Design a protein around this motif. Structure first.
Motif, PDB file in Angstrom:
ATOM      1  N   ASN A   1      88.154  81.434  26.607  1.00 27.97           N
ATOM      2  CA  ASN A   1      87.080  82.005  27.401  1.00 27.97           C
ATOM      3  C   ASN A   1      86.775  83.439  27.026  1.00 27.97           C
ATOM      4  O   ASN A   1      85.830  84.010  27.572  1.00 27.97           O
ATOM      5  CB  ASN A   1      87.418  81.966  28.883  1.00 27.97           C
ATOM      6  CG  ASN A   1      88.178  83.171  29.315  1.00 27.97           C
ATOM      7  OD1 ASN A   1      87.593  84.182  29.698  1.00 27.97           O
ATOM      8  ND2 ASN A   1      89.498  83.090  29.243  1.00 27.97           N
ATOM      9  N   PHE A   2      87.570  84.041  26.151  1.00 24.04           N
ATOM     10  CA  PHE A   2      87.271  85.361  25.624  1.00 24.04           C
ATOM     11  C   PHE A   2      87.029  86.358  26.744  1.00 24.04           C
ATOM     12  O   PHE A   2      86.011  87.049  26.791  1.00 24.04           O
ATOM     13  CB  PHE A   2      86.074  85.299  24.698  1.00 24.04           C
ATOM     14  CG  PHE A   2      86.209  84.292  23.642  1.00 24.04           C
ATOM     15  CD1 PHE A   2      85.887  82.988  23.879  1.00 24.04           C
ATOM     16  CD2 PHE A   2      86.646  84.647  22.403  1.00 24.04           C
ATOM     17  CE1 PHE A   2      86.001  82.066  22.908  1.00 24.04           C
ATOM     18  CE2 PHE A   2      86.766  83.717  21.427  1.00 24.04           C
ATOM     19  CZ  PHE A   2      86.443  82.423  21.680  1.00 24.04           C
ATOM     20  N   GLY A   3      87.972  86.412  27.673  1.00 26.00           N
ATOM     21  CA  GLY A   3      87.851  87.373  28.741  1.00 26.00           C
ATOM     22  C   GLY A   3      86.608  87.202  29.566  1.00 26.00           C
ATOM     23  O   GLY A   3      86.111  88.174  30.130  1.00 26.00           O
ATOM     24  N   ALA A   4      86.059  86.000  29.617  1.00 22.37           N
ATOM     25  CA  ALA A   4      85.048  85.716  30.613  1.00 22.37           C
ATOM     26  C   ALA A   4      85.734  85.501  31.949  1.00 22.37           C
ATOM     27  O   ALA A   4      86.900  85.844  32.142  1.00 22.37           O
ATOM     28  CB  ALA A   4      84.248  84.483  30.224  1.00 22.37           C
ATOM     29  N   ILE A   5      85.009  84.932  32.896  1.00 21.31           N
ATOM     30  CA  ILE A   5      85.739  84.367  34.013  1.00 21.31           C
ATOM     31  C   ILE A   5      86.000  82.894  33.755  1.00 21.31           C
ATOM     32  O   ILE A   5      86.920  82.309  34.333  1.00 21.31           O
ATOM     33  CB  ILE A   5      84.985  84.584  35.331  1.00 21.31           C
ATOM     34  CG1 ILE A   5      85.803  84.064  36.507  1.00 21.31           C
ATOM     35  CG2 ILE A   5      83.688  83.845  35.317  1.00 21.31           C
ATOM     36  CD1 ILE A   5      85.137  84.267  37.843  1.00 21.31           C
ATOM     37  N   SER A   6      85.231  82.272  32.868  1.00 26.32           N
ATOM     38  CA  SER A   6      85.299  80.833  32.700  1.00 26.32           C
ATOM     39  C   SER A   6      85.207  80.471  31.229  1.00 26.32           C
ATOM     40  O   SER A   6      84.856  81.292  30.380  1.00 26.32           O
ATOM     41  CB  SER A   6      84.180  80.128  33.470  1.00 26.32           C
ATOM     42  OG  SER A   6      82.999  80.049  32.689  1.00 26.32           O
ATOM     43  N   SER A   7      85.523  79.210  30.942  1.00 22.58           N
ATOM     44  CA  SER A   7      85.347  78.628  29.623  1.00 22.58           C
ATOM     45  C   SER A   7      84.238  77.594  29.586  1.00 22.58           C
ATOM     46  O   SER A   7      84.020  76.978  28.544  1.00 22.58           O
ATOM     47  CB  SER A   7      86.643  77.997  29.142  1.00 22.58           C
ATOM     48  OG  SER A   7      87.471  78.968  28.545  1.00 22.58           O
TER      49      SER A   7
ATOM     50  N   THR B   1      91.177  71.782  16.500  1.00 20.03           N
ATOM     51  CA  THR B   1      91.136  73.171  16.908  1.00 20.03           C
ATOM     52  C   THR B   1      89.706  73.588  17.149  1.00 20.03           C
ATOM     53  O   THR B   1      89.429  74.391  18.045  1.00 20.03           O
ATOM     54  CB  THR B   1      91.798  74.071  15.875  1.00 20.03           C
ATOM     55  OG1 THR B   1      91.815  75.408  16.375  1.00 20.03           O
ATOM     56  CG2 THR B   1      91.041  74.057  14.585  1.00 20.03           C
ATOM     57  N   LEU B   2      88.778  73.022  16.385  1.00 26.26           N
ATOM     58  CA  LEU B   2      87.390  73.394  16.565  1.00 26.26           C
ATOM     59  C   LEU B   2      86.975  73.185  18.003  1.00 26.26           C
ATOM     60  O   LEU B   2      86.521  74.116  18.672  1.00 26.26           O
ATOM     61  CB  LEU B   2      86.493  72.598  15.634  1.00 26.26           C
ATOM     62  CG  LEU B   2      85.053  73.047  15.858  1.00 26.26           C
ATOM     63  CD1 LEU B   2      84.372  73.272  14.555  1.00 26.26           C
ATOM     64  CD2 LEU B   2      84.273  72.037  16.659  1.00 26.26           C
ATOM     65  N   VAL B   3      87.134  71.973  18.508  1.00 31.50           N
ATOM     66  CA  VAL B   3      86.736  71.765  19.895  1.00 31.50           C
ATOM     67  C   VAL B   3      87.624  72.576  20.815  1.00 31.50           C
ATOM     68  O   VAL B   3      87.147  73.212  21.763  1.00 31.50           O
ATOM     69  CB  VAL B   3      86.756  70.279  20.269  1.00 31.50           C
ATOM     70  CG1 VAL B   3      88.057  69.659  19.869  1.00 31.50           C
ATOM     71  CG2 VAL B   3      86.541  70.131  21.762  1.00 31.50           C
ATOM     72  N   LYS B   4      88.917  72.617  20.517  1.00 32.31           N
ATOM     73  CA  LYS B   4      89.853  73.261  21.413  1.00 32.31           C
ATOM     74  C   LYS B   4      89.482  74.699  21.664  1.00 32.31           C
ATOM     75  O   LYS B   4      89.845  75.248  22.706  1.00 32.31           O
ATOM     76  CB  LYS B   4      91.255  73.188  20.837  1.00 32.31           C
ATOM     77  CG  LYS B   4      91.931  71.878  21.079  1.00 32.31           C
ATOM     78  CD  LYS B   4      93.419  72.062  20.993  1.00 32.31           C
ATOM     79  CE  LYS B   4      93.859  73.183  21.906  1.00 32.31           C
ATOM     80  NZ  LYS B   4      95.319  73.425  21.834  1.00 32.31           N
ATOM     81  N   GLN B   5      88.760  75.313  20.734  1.00 30.89           N
ATOM     82  CA  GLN B   5      88.302  76.670  20.969  1.00 30.89           C
ATOM     83  C   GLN B   5      87.687  76.807  22.340  1.00 30.89           C
ATOM     84  O   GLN B   5      87.987  77.753  23.070  1.00 30.89           O
ATOM     85  CB  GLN B   5      87.296  77.078  19.909  1.00 30.89           C
ATOM     86  CG  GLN B   5      87.805  76.861  18.548  1.00 30.89           C
ATOM     87  CD  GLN B   5      89.105  77.566  18.339  1.00 30.89           C
ATOM     88  OE1 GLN B   5      89.985  77.069  17.642  1.00 30.89           O
ATOM     89  NE2 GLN B   5      89.233  78.754  18.917  1.00 30.89           N
ATOM     90  N   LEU B   6      86.868  75.839  22.735  1.00 30.24           N
ATOM     91  CA  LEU B   6      86.140  76.017  23.975  1.00 30.24           C
ATOM     92  C   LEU B   6      87.051  76.229  25.165  1.00 30.24           C
ATOM     93  O   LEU B   6      86.564  76.621  26.226  1.00 30.24           O
ATOM     94  CB  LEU B   6      85.216  74.843  24.218  1.00 30.24           C
ATOM     95  CG  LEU B   6      84.010  74.897  23.294  1.00 30.24           C
ATOM     96  CD1 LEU B   6      82.910  74.058  23.880  1.00 30.24           C
ATOM     97  CD2 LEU B   6      83.544  76.317  23.129  1.00 30.24           C
ATOM     98  N   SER B   7      88.352  76.012  25.019  1.00 31.79           N
ATOM     99  CA  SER B   7      89.259  76.560  26.012  1.00 31.79           C
ATOM    100  C   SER B   7      89.177  78.074  26.035  1.00 31.79           C
ATOM    101  O   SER B   7      89.151  78.681  27.109  1.00 31.79           O
ATOM    102  CB  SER B   7      90.689  76.142  25.720  1.00 31.79           C
ATOM    103  OG  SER B   7      91.294  77.108  24.879  1.00 31.79           O
TER     104      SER B   7
ATOM    105  N   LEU C   1      80.305  77.757  30.136  1.00 28.84           N
ATOM    106  CA  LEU C   1      79.156  78.623  30.354  1.00 28.84           C
ATOM    107  C   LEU C   1      78.433  78.282  31.641  1.00 28.84           C
ATOM    108  O   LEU C   1      77.953  79.170  32.356  1.00 28.84           O
ATOM    109  CB  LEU C   1      78.216  78.504  29.162  1.00 28.84           C
ATOM    110  CG  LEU C   1      77.540  77.146  28.974  1.00 28.84           C
ATOM    111  CD1 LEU C   1      76.420  77.271  27.981  1.00 28.84           C
ATOM    112  CD2 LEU C   1      78.506  76.071  28.515  1.00 28.84           C
ATOM    113  N   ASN C   2      78.364  76.996  31.960  1.00 24.88           N
ATOM    114  CA  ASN C   2      77.746  76.584  33.207  1.00 24.88           C
ATOM    115  C   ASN C   2      78.455  77.230  34.388  1.00 24.88           C
ATOM    116  O   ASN C   2      77.819  77.801  35.287  1.00 24.88           O
ATOM    117  CB  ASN C   2      77.792  75.060  33.305  1.00 24.88           C
ATOM    118  CG  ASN C   2      77.619  74.388  31.956  1.00 24.88           C
ATOM    119  OD1 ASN C   2      76.919  74.897  31.086  1.00 24.88           O
ATOM    120  ND2 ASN C   2      78.244  73.230  31.786  1.00 24.88           N
ATOM    121  N   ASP C   3      79.786  77.180  34.372  1.00 22.67           N
ATOM    122  CA  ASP C   3      80.564  77.726  35.471  1.00 22.67           C
ATOM    123  C   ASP C   3      80.259  79.199  35.670  1.00 22.67           C
ATOM    124  O   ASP C   3      80.028  79.649  36.796  1.00 22.67           O
ATOM    125  CB  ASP C   3      82.050  77.525  35.199  1.00 22.67           C
ATOM    126  CG  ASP C   3      82.909  77.947  36.358  1.00 22.67           C
ATOM    127  OD1 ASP C   3      82.423  77.865  37.501  1.00 22.67           O
ATOM    128  OD2 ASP C   3      84.064  78.362  36.135  1.00 22.67           O
TER     129      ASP C   3
END
Lengths: 49, 49
Positions: free
Chosen positions: B25-31, B17-23, B33-35
């Motif tokens: 995106n918390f209401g960004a446009i992306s998950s 789950t720790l890594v999976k968090q990076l899915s 940061l580079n994108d």
């Protein structure tokens, strides 16, 4: 061409012709230049874009 | 071996789950940061990041 002159606010002027840092800043103030009615000024008179 | 398979299980699935968090995106446009920085100009992307 003065509307876009603001911290982080974009504009080719702010892109290439006039500097604009998006951090701490004093402020942008302006008022019309009615004092300029010479349509030619016998010169080129300005550098922009 | 449940009493230990469970330990390794808790460990793993935790990391999972720790890594999976990076899915998330918390209401960004992306998950990625580079994108999203590549999505926007600096300023708004700042608070977005």
């Amino acid at each position: 061409e003065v509307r876009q002159i603001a911290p982080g606010q974009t504009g080719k002027i702010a892109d290439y012709n006039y500097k604009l840092p998006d951090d701490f800043t004093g402020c942008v103030i302006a008022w019309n230049s009615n004092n300029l009615d010479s349509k030619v000024g016998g010169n080129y008179n300005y550098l922009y874009r | 071996l449940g009493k230990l398979q469970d330990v390794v299980n808790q460990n793993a699935q935790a990391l999972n789950t720790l890594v999976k968090q990076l899915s998330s995106n918390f209401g960004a446009i992306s998950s990625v940061l580079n994108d999203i920085l590549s999505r926007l100009d600096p300023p708004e992307a700042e608070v977005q990041i």
